[PDB]
Design a protein around this nucleic acid. Structure first.
Ligand SMILES: [Mg+2]
Ligand SMILES: [Mg+2]
Ligand SMILES: [Mg+2]
Ligand SMILES: [Mg+2]
Ligand SMILES: [Mg+2]
Ligand SMILES: [Mg+2]
Ligand SMILES: [Mg+2]
Ligand SMILES: [Mg+2]
Ligand SMILES: [Mg+2]
Ligand SMILES: [Mg+2]
Ligand SMILES: [Mg+2]
Ligand SMILES: [Mg+2]
Ligand SMILES: [Mg+2]
Ligand SMILES: [Mg+2]
Ligand SMILES: [Mg+2]
Ligand SMILES: [Mg+2]
Ligand SMILES: [Mg+2]
Ligand SMILES: [Mg+2]
Ligand SMILES: [Mg+2]
Ligand SMILES: [Mg+2]
Ligand SMILES: [Mg+2]
Ligand SMILES: [Mg+2]
Ligand SMILES: [Mg+2]
Ligand SMILES: [Mg+2]
Ligand SMILES: [Mg+2]
Ligand SMILES: [Mg+2]
Ligand SMILES: [Mg+2]
Ligand SMILES: [Mg+2]
Ligand SMILES: [Mg+2]
Ligand SMILES: [Mg+2]
Ligand SMILES: [Mg+2]
Ligand SMILES: [Mg+2]
Ligand SMILES: [Mg+2]
Ligand SMILES: [Mg+2]
Ligand SMILES: [Mg+2]
Ligand SMILES: [Mg+2]
Ligand SMILES: [Mg+2]
Ligand SMILES: [Mg+2]
Ligand SMILES: [Mg+2]
Ligand SMILES: [Mg+2]
Ligand SMILES: [Mg+2]
Ligand SMILES: [Mg+2]
Ligand SMILES: [Mg+2]
Ligand SMILES: [Mg+2]
Ligand SMILES: [Mg+2]
Ligand SMILES: [Mg+2]
Ligand SMILES: [Mg+2]
Ligand SMILES: [Mg+2]
Ligand SMILES: [Mg+2]
Ligand SMILES: [Mg+2]
Ligand SMILES: [Mg+2]
Ligand SMILES: [Mg+2]
Ligand SMILES: [Mg+2]
Ligand SMILES: [Mg+2]
Ligand SMILES: [Mg+2]
Ligand SMILES: [Mg+2]
Ligand SMILES: [Mg+2]
Ligand SMILES: [Mg+2]
Ligand SMILES: [Mg+2]
Ligand SMILES: [Mg+2]
Ligand SMILES: [Mg+2]
Ligand SMILES: [Mg+2]
Ligand SMILES: [Mg+2]
Ligand SMILES: [Mg+2]
Ligand SMILES: [Mg+2]
Ligand SMILES: [Mg+2]
Ligand SMILES: [Mg+2]
Ligand SMILES: [Mg+2]
Ligand SMILES: [Mg+2]
Ligand SMILES: [Mg+2]
Ligand SMILES: [Mg+2]
Ligand SMILES: [Mg+2]
Ligand SMILES: [Mg+2]
Ligand SMILES: [Mg+2]
Ligand SMILES: [Mg+2]
Ligand SMILES: [Mg+2]
Ligand SMILES: [Mg+2]
Ligand SMILES: [Mg+2]
Ligand SMILES: [Mg+2]
Ligand SMILES: [Mg+2]
Ligand SMILES: [Mg+2]
Ligand SMILES: [Mg+2]
Ligand SMILES: [Mg+2]
Ligand SMILES: [Mg+2]
Ligand SMILES: [Mg+2]
Ligand SMILES: [Mg+2]
Ligand SMILES: [Mg+2]
Ligand SMILES: [Mg+2]
Ligand SMILES: [Mg+2]
Ligand SMILES: [Mg+2]
Ligand SMILES: [Mg+2]
Ligand SMILES: [Mg+2]
Ligand SMILES: [Mg+2]
Ligand SMILES: [Mg+2]
Ligand SMILES: [Mg+2]
Ligand SMILES: [Mg+2]
Ligand SMILES: [Mg+2]
Ligand SMILES: [Mg+2]
Ligand SMILES: [Mg+2]
Ligand SMILES: [Mg+2]
Ligand SMILES: [Mg+2]
Ligand SMILES: [Mg+2]
Ligand SMILES: [Mg+2]
Ligand SMILES: [Mg+2]
Ligand SMILES: [Mg+2]
Ligand SMILES: [Mg+2]
Ligand SMILES: [Mg+2]
Ligand SMILES: [Mg+2]
Ligand SMILES: [Mg+2]
Ligand SMILES: [Mg+2]
Ligand SMILES: [Mg+2]
Ligand SMILES: [Mg+2]
Ligand SMILES: [Mg+2]
Ligand SMILES: [Mg+2]
Ligand SMILES: [Mg+2]
Ligand SMILES: [Mg+2]
Ligand SMILES: [Mg+2]
Ligand SMILES: [Mg+2]
Ligand SMILES: [Mg+2]
Ligand SMILES: [Mg+2]
Ligand SMILES: [Mg+2]
Ligand SMILES: [Mg+2]
Ligand SMILES: [Mg+2]
Ligand SMILES: [Mg+2]
Ligand SMILES: [Mg+2]
Ligand SMILES: [Mg+2]
Ligand SMILES: [Mg+2]
Ligand SMILES: [Mg+2]
Ligand SMILES: [Mg+2]
Ligand SMILES: [Mg+2]
Ligand SMILES: [Mg+2]
Ligand SMILES: [Mg+2]
Ligand SMILES: [Mg+2]
Ligand SMILES: [Mg+2]
Ligand SMILES: [Mg+2]
Ligand SMILES: [Mg+2]
Ligand SMILES: [Mg+2]
Ligand SMILES: [Mg+2]
Ligand SMILES: [Mg+2]
Ligand SMILES: [Mg+2]
Ligand SMILES: [Mg+2]
Ligand SMILES: [Mg+2]
Ligand SMILES: [Mg+2]
Ligand SMILES: [Mg+2]
Ligand SMILES: [Mg+2]
Ligand SMILES: [Mg+2]
Ligand SMILES: [Mg+2]
Ligand SMILES: [Mg+2]
Ligand SMILES: [Mg+2]
Ligand SMILES: [Mg+2]
Ligand SMILES: [Mg+2]
Ligand SMILES: [Mg+2]
Ligand SMILES: [Mg+2]
Ligand SMILES: [Mg+2]
Ligand SMILES: [Mg+2]
Ligand SMILES: [Mg+2]
Ligand SMILES: [Mg+2]
Ligand SMILES: [Mg+2]
Ligand SMILES: [Mg+2]
Ligand SMILES: [Mg+2]
Ligand SMILES: [Mg+2]
Ligand SMILES: [Mg+2]
Ligand SMILES: [Mg+2]
Ligand SMILES: [Mg+2]
Ligand SMILES: [Mg+2]
Ligand SMILES: [Mg+2]
Ligand SMILES: [Mg+2]
Ligand SMILES: [Mg+2]
Ligand SMILES: [Mg+2]
Ligand SMILES: [Mg+2]
Ligand SMILES: [Mg+2]
Ligand SMILES: [Mg+2]
Ligand SMILES: [Mg+2]
Ligand SMILES: [Mg+2]
Ligand SMILES: [Mg+2]
Ligand SMILES: [Mg+2]
Ligand SMILES: [Mg+2]
Ligand SMILES: [Mg+2]
Ligand SMILES: [Mg+2]
Ligand SMILES: [Mg+2]
Ligand SMILES: [Mg+2]
Ligand SMILES: [Mg+2]
Ligand SMILES: [Mg+2]
Lengths: 62, 100, 88, 92
RNA sequence: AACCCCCCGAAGCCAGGGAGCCAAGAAAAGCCUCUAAGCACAACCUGCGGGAACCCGUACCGCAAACCGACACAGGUGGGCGG
RNA sequence: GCCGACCCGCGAGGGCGGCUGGAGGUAAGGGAAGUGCGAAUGCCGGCAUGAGUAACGAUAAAGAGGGUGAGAAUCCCUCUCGCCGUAAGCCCAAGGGUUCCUACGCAAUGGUCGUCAGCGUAGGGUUAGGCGGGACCUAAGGUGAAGCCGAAAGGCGUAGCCGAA
RNA sequence: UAGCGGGCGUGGAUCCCUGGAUGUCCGAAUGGGGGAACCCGGCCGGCGGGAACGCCGGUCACCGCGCUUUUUGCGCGGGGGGAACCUGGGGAACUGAAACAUCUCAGUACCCAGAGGAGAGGAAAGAGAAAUCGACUCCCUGAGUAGCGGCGAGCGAAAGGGGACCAGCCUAAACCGUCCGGCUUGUCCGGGCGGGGUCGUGGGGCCCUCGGACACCGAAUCCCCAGCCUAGCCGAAGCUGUUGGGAAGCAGCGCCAGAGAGGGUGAAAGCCCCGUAGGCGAAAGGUGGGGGGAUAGGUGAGGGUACCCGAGUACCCCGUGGUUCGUGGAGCCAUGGGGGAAUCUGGGCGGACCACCGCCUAAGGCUAAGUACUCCGGGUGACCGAUAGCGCACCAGUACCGUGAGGGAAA
């Protein structure tokens, strides 16, 4: 259901849009690295966080 | 697609073999193998466990899947086929001669 | 080759040697052979510049006749090959 | 895109002996310049790199059953952070 | 820790050395110099300061059990050191 | 499918009975054919004989003690003996591609054995402005604007470009 | 595709159909290089402190045609691929002849260029004996006839008749107008554009007499819809005994049937499950003259003038090809070489040639359908059932083999 949620947020991301798109993506990107960085060490990772964040990025990218 | 079939998660009769006549709520339905889990076919697995984690696993005689054909849905009247009628809007399924 | 006003690819065809009388009999001996189109080079002035033509001997005049049609055409400025193209 | 160049920290005593010095090393994108590594880790850990080193690591070939297999290739990068700074993230 | 004398000594270095001989012994860029166009507040040249410096290879085998010989095969494989 | 000393048929074959086997089979009467195998130095596969035979791959060569281990002539250590030493030692290039290292392990690979390994599982391991190569040059050659030639495919080919131990 | 680990779904996920997005690198491969999957770069913009350095987005191959003032630019297009089918250019030998050379195999195999859902062909300078037929292709027949033939081996038509399909158009030239440039200024010459013209009972042009607009014919082009393809959905009728591990077997009493095809369910079920008969369905993409509409286009009688009616062409001769036709009495079609016309008192053909009678109008182009094939989807089988059947029922063009082309299993 998280889809309907984030979607509206993105045309909502039309304060600055292409610019905030980029700002927001870059952010989600870091969170992703921070994530897999901790995922590699083992004792700081669950799971579904990644794929959810991965696809999260995708629709932002759209 | 099309994998769909008889009933889902609810009350159902078993016209199988070792558990003919029996009745119970189907706690699971795996469409891939076309079988459903009820309360009938429950066999004893001797295995300790496949995964080393959690030492004690169970000599449990848990529920064994069952071909989704030997089980039939049911309502006020016992054991009935499934017709379907389109509601005033949606799409509900009436039994042999009653509702739901 | 052959390309020009002409357009005559050289074609191959039998050259069969016969031995005979004619009003007594006539026998043979066959083989394949290539007939080339008598074609010559044709240099010509045409506006500025000069311009040649790897043309058949048959259609030699057709060139000169076409050099006439070209008088009624507007052409200039470095056009060696290009002339040929625009030259009908 | 910039957090895409750095993939994950390499976990080796050899990688650890590097923390003792100013040398933090980790997995990086196969197609990546020592130059683009610099600016990437720089703006990823708020530090300043002075010197960068790179290796390719031909993926070892594992197998299962009768099925031959090939592990993906990777790129090591070892960076020298300016004398007098650190990555508490890598420290753990 | 001593780490110094004496002797032998290269085919190697100085190197584009020399002599003789006939069979008469690569090219191009770097580097230097000349001037065109252009330009001469440029540009080039020497020095100092500050900054910048990518891509690929680098394990191991390598006269052999890891290369070519169906084989941990008495065979085969170019260069250097070889007390 | 395996067994039969029974029954019918001249015979190919048919039937009945026992054991196995566990999901198919197809009268009478007709129809259609990939229709019957012992040989083809036939084809594919399986298993024999030779035979516990020949051989175990350089005549440089071994021995003992201790250790590890279910298990040791064969793995580890020590001492003794022997062989190479313009090599059977050391470095580089080609080719080979993880065989390097460590931990665990021996079904198979190793011409015996094997705890060992170049072997199985997993983890690690290759760091360059100066070394080699490319952001330099050209060689034979190759390519190939122009240009020339050839039924088509294509063949020569200047400049340029590629090409190095 | 189980398991460790963690999630999502009637606020309708997974999944299926349609359209869109992203889509590294190589490959026609296209900035350049190159040992495909790699290496180096120019220009404009952006990122980093960023001038050196690196990264990111955009752009830069070559050829052809048209536009452009040579040029530089701008636009449309081409390139490479495809099982078989198709068309053109080139084109074998084994073999047959019981040797072999003509001949046969065969215009086959194959190499090459090109076309496309087809391709080719196509509205008579035809057929050929009927004062007859009426584009083209395809099938049946004609016919193993006619005929060709070291008259050996062999090879082998056509007209006509029965069918499928059905359709016919555009232009060159005379003649009128215009714009441009060339030059010896002219009622001109040529080039481009427009109108006109398109035929064989000969037609057209220009000059005369006349009734045609509102007459009719009408697409092969464009437009709307129907219908169909790409997901789906509805779908009748059974229950108790009984042997059994297990009923769908057996016994008892019923029921449906526009559905008793088939498959599944612990064994042999119309009524248990999926189906079947019958019947519904598309917002989106594709298809679509089948139905309708519109436009392009086209349509006449008689008389004079004799202007035009496709040129290195017809025609003739030398060399050859195609056809049933092997130089034969050898035409017709096609054309490498030489000579070389006429525009309807023109010119080709009816198997040498001549006369007679009749046929048809060459030298420019386009045209659907019937036809071929099967990579792909579906349906059906007196088709196979793992030595069969495709080489592959199974992670096969794989393992393995070979420098390579290539070979190619088992399971
Ligand atoms: Mg933007
Ligand atoms: Mg994921
Ligand atoms: Mg966006
Ligand atoms: Mg748990
Ligand atoms: Mg227990
Ligand atoms: Mg040519
Ligand atoms: Mg005579
Ligand atoms: Mg001449
Ligand atoms: Mg001149
Ligand atoms: Mg020429
Ligand atoms: Mg010109
Ligand atoms: Mg021009
Ligand atoms: Mg032009
Ligand atoms: Mg490096
Ligand atoms: Mg594994
Ligand atoms: Mg595999
Ligand atoms: Mg892989
Ligand atoms: Mg993979
Ligand atoms: Mg992987
Ligand atoms: Mg000293
Ligand atoms: Mg000497
Ligand atoms: Mg010198
Ligand atoms: Mg020198
Ligand atoms: Mg000298
Ligand atoms: Mg001197
Ligand atoms: Mg140069
Ligand atoms: Mg000067
Ligand atoms: Mg001067
Ligand atoms: Mg200083
Ligand atoms: Mg670079
Ligand atoms: Mg090294
Ligand atoms: Mg080394
Ligand atoms: Mg060594
Ligand atoms: Mg050797
Ligand atoms: Mg090997
Ligand atoms: Mg070998
Ligand atoms: Mg050995
Ligand atoms: Mg010495
Ligand atoms: Mg009996
Ligand atoms: Mg009897
Ligand atoms: Mg008998
Ligand atoms: Mg029996
Ligand atoms: Mg039996
Ligand atoms: Mg039968
Ligand atoms: Mg034999
Ligand atoms: Mg023998
Ligand atoms: Mg065998
Ligand atoms: Mg034996
Ligand atoms: Mg024996
Ligand atoms: Mg013996
Ligand atoms: Mg031996
Ligand atoms: Mg012996
Ligand atoms: Mg012996
Ligand atoms: Mg021996
Ligand atoms: Mg002792
Ligand atoms: Mg020990
Ligand atoms: Mg033992
Ligand atoms: Mg011992
Ligand atoms: Mg010595
Ligand atoms: Mg090397
Ligand atoms: Mg090998
Ligand atoms: Mg060990
Ligand atoms: Mg072993
Ligand atoms: Mg063993
Ligand atoms: Mg051996
Ligand atoms: Mg042990
Ligand atoms: Mg040991
Ligand atoms: Mg250094
Ligand atoms: Mg060069
Ligand atoms: Mg050269
Ligand atoms: Mg060439
Ligand atoms: Mg060019
Ligand atoms: Mg050259
Ligand atoms: Mg070069
Ligand atoms: Mg998975
Ligand atoms: Mg699972
Ligand atoms: Mg597990
Ligand atoms: Mg899509
Ligand atoms: Mg779009
Ligand atoms: Mg992207
Ligand atoms: Mg690119
Ligand atoms: Mg590319
Ligand atoms: Mg391009
Ligand atoms: Mg290229
Ligand atoms: Mg650049
Ligand atoms: Mg670029
Ligand atoms: Mg820039
Ligand atoms: Mg600044
Ligand atoms: Mg700036
Ligand atoms: Mg770019
Ligand atoms: Mg482009
Ligand atoms: Mg450009
Ligand atoms: Mg340009
Ligand atoms: Mg271009
Ligand atoms: Mg090129
Ligand atoms: Mg080019
Ligand atoms: Mg160009
Ligand atoms: Mg010019
Ligand atoms: Mg120019
Ligand atoms: Mg030009
Ligand atoms: Mg141009
Ligand atoms: Mg230019
Ligand atoms: Mg251009
Ligand atoms: Mg094509
Ligand atoms: Mg022959
Ligand atoms: Mg004969
Ligand atoms: Mg003979
Ligand atoms: Mg012949
Ligand atoms: Mg023939
Ligand atoms: Mg031919
Ligand atoms: Mg068709
Ligand atoms: Mg067609
Ligand atoms: Mg056509
Ligand atoms: Mg045609
Ligand atoms: Mg045509
Ligand atoms: Mg015909
Ligand atoms: Mg047919
Ligand atoms: Mg017949
Ligand atoms: Mg004949
Ligand atoms: Mg013949
Ligand atoms: Mg023939
Ligand atoms: Mg007929
Ligand atoms: Mg007919
Ligand atoms: Mg016109
Ligand atoms: Mg005119
Ligand atoms: Mg004119
Ligand atoms: Mg005019
Ligand atoms: Mg004209
Ligand atoms: Mg015209
Ligand atoms: Mg007109
Ligand atoms: Mg008129
Ligand atoms: Mg008209
Ligand atoms: Mg008219
Ligand atoms: Mg006509
Ligand atoms: Mg007239
Ligand atoms: Mg109409
Ligand atoms: Mg439409
Ligand atoms: Mg509709
Ligand atoms: Mg019951
Ligand atoms: Mg029952
Ligand atoms: Mg029975
Ligand atoms: Mg039926
Ligand atoms: Mg039955
Ligand atoms: Mg049934
Ligand atoms: Mg239906
Ligand atoms: Mg629907
Ligand atoms: Mg409908
Ligand atoms: Mg269409
Ligand atoms: Mg349409
Ligand atoms: Mg529609
Ligand atoms: Mg139609
Ligand atoms: Mg109209
Ligand atoms: Mg009228
Ligand atoms: Mg008159
Ligand atoms: Mg007249
Ligand atoms: Mg006139
Ligand atoms: Mg006139
Ligand atoms: Mg003409
Ligand atoms: Mg004639
Ligand atoms: Mg002939
Ligand atoms: Mg002939
Ligand atoms: Mg012929
Ligand atoms: Mg023939
Ligand atoms: Mg003859
Ligand atoms: Mg001729
Ligand atoms: Mg005339
Ligand atoms: Mg006339
Ligand atoms: Mg006349
Ligand atoms: Mg007349
Ligand atoms: Mg006349
Ligand atoms: Mg006649
Ligand atoms: Mg008459
Ligand atoms: Mg005729
Ligand atoms: Mg005509
Ligand atoms: Mg058709
Ligand atoms: Mg099919
Ligand atoms: Mg088998
Ligand atoms: Mg078998
Ligand atoms: Mg398969
Ligand atoms: Mg599978
Ligand atoms: Mg094999
Ligand atoms: Mg090989
Ligand atoms: Mg073979």
């Amino acid at each position: 259901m998280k889809l309907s949620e984030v979607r509206k947020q993105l045309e909502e991301a039309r304060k600055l849009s292409p610019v905030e798109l980029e700002k927001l993506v870059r952010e989600k990107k870091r969170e992703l690295m921070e994530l897999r960085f901790q995922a590699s060490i083992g004792q700081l990772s669950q799971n579904h966080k990644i794929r959810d964040l991965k696809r999260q990025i995708a629709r932002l990218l759209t | 697609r099309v994998k769909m079939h008889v009933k889902k998660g609810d009350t159902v009769l078993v016209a199988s073999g070792k558990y003919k006549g029996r009745v119970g709520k189907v706690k699971e339905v795996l469409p891939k193998k076309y079988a459903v889990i009820v309360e009938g076919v429950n066999i004893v697995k001797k295995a300790v466990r496949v995964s080393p984690k959690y030492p004690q696993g169970g000599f449990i005689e848990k529920e064994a899947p069952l071909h989704a054909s030997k089980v039939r849905p049911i309502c006020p009247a016992c054991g009935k086929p499934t017709r379907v009628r389109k509601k005033f809007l949606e799409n509900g399924k009436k039994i042999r001669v009653c509702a739901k | 080759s052959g390309k020009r006003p002409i357009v005559a690819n050289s074609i191959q065809r039998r050259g069969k040697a016969k031995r005979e009388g004619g009003v007594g009999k006539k026998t043979t001996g066959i083989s394949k052979r290539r007939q080339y189109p008598n074609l010559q080079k044709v240099r010509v002035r045409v506006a500025g510049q000069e311009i040649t033509f790897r043309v058949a001997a048959s259609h030699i005049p057709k060139v000169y006749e076409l050099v006439e049609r070209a008088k009624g055409l507007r052409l200039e400025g470095l056009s060696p090959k290009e002339i040929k193209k625009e030259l009908l | 895109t910039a957090y895409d160049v750095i993939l994950a920290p390499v976990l080796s005593e050899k990688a650890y002996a590097g923390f003792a010095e100013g040398k933090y090393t980790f997995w990086v994108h196969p197609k990546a310049t020592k130059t683009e590594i610099k600016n990437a880790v720089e703006t990823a850990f708020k530090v300043k790199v002075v010197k960068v080193n790179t290796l390719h690591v031909r993926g070892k070939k594992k197998r299962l059953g009768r099925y031959l297999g090939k592990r993906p290739d990777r790129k090591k990068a070892i960076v020298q952070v300016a004398p007098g700074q650190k990555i508490e993230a890598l420290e753990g």
